[PDB]
Design a protein around this ligand. Sequence first.
Ligand SMILES: Cc1ccccc1-c1cc(Nc2cc(O)cc(O)c2C(=O)N2Cc3ccccc3C2)n(C)n1
Ligand SMILES: [Cl-]
Length: 208
Amino acid sequence: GFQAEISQLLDLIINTFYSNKEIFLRELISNSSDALDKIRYAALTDPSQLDSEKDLYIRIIPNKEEGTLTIRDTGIGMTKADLVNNLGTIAKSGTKAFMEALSSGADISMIGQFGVGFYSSYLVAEKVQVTTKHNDDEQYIWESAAGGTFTITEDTEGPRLGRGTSMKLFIKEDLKEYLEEKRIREIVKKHSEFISYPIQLVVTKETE
Ligand SMILES: Cc1ccccc1-c1cc(Nc2cc(O)cc(O)c2C(=O)N2Cc3ccccc3C2)n(C)n1
Ligand SMILES: [Cl-]
């Protein structure tokens, strides 16, 4: 497909035009919140939809040894067909919409309106590992790196999500401030006041 070129294009453009890198976390939390809204609504008519995971929440897990920041939610998750549609039709179409808004001088502050908000993670990450699990399907993993072509793979080696999506961001070397507890908490409190789901952070005792 065109993930190699799209990821390269959006990596370059997004890092060029969004100097406030901390909005990557706003986009992650907003997308998690939408996925959680989706399973919450589905559970109204089929309560058994929550059998996979009863709790609706967003959890942030930094790993300084690995250099990763993981945002996991217990939202509706993505089927393989959902993920394929994101990588194909949505990425191509939203890149066009984003680039035309960029070109026409239109306001592009809310990048998620173009359907490519996923790529705002390149503000701080050089690679994103997507794990996702929808009630109708198996757990899948897909990796995004600029210029890469990665096949969607059935994830049998990973920890079970139960249900939802986990975005694991491999943070660029100069930007490890985004793994720090106090920095994460300021950003969430600034950019996610109106989120109606618990936002959790794993804090680890430090040596020393
Ligand atoms: C990965 C990718 C590559 C290329 C283009 C786009 C994407 C791509 C993938 C996603 N999905 C998620 C991103 C997240 O940060 C967190 C999530 O929980 C999800 C998710 O599972 N849903 C399911 C669903 C159901 C209803 C409404 C909203 C959502 C979001 N979004 C928005 N965008
Ligand atoms: Cl966890």
